């Protein structure tokens, strides 16, 4: 169908965005490269590790 | 340019059909609501020349591309809804009328329920 | 990437008429090939092994 792949886009984009936005502030040294930049990357690795690759 | 983007086969094809309703009904009131002028209670010689034919052929094309995208008696509601909520321009809403009754498949009878109940 | 590739898979009286004809054009058709969904699921099931492979060496320390 279609909804589905839309569905799994937009969740996608919205995490890509995020990330992006993240990587620029770990360029400027805005954050910090202490952590919870660490713990906030292994939050989006589960969130996609659950249903990765289903097969059709 | 404006109307053939509009023209929802480039669109419909990419975007979930649940947010496009939503632009369209709130384009649907924006181009009612917008300059309510000629609220004359006398805009009556003045259908004459907001007739089908005479309305502009884009006026015409949006319209029933706004039909088409989506579903009859949705819009017979709405616009129930909107004429009861909120002032109109009468030269859109005629000429709207004008294009719902010939376009769409008999709700002519679904017109003169609303009226009966107005 | 796989979700365009498939969204470019998705593209290709009187009034009444040519409302019946627009109806015709937009009727509810999917055509999200298979064979596509896979070759990028390969491409994808490559990537998701080097993000699984980094996320061991983030976890652990």
Known sequence: RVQYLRQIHANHETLLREVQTLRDRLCTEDEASSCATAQRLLQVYRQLRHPSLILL | CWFGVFSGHTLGSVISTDPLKRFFSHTLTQILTHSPVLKASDAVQMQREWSFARTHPLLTSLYRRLFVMLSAEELVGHLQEVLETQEVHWQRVLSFVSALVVCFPEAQQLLEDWVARL | ?61
């Open chain 3, 1 to 61: 990437s796989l979700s365009s590739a498939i969204a470019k898979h998705e593209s290709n009286p009187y009034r009444k008429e040519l409302q019946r004809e627009k109806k015709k054009m937009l009727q509810t058709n999917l055509k999200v090939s298979g064979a596509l969904y896979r070759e990028i699921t390969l491409k994808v099931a490559e990537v998701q092994l080097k993000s699984d492979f980094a996320a061991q060496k983030l976890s652990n320390l």
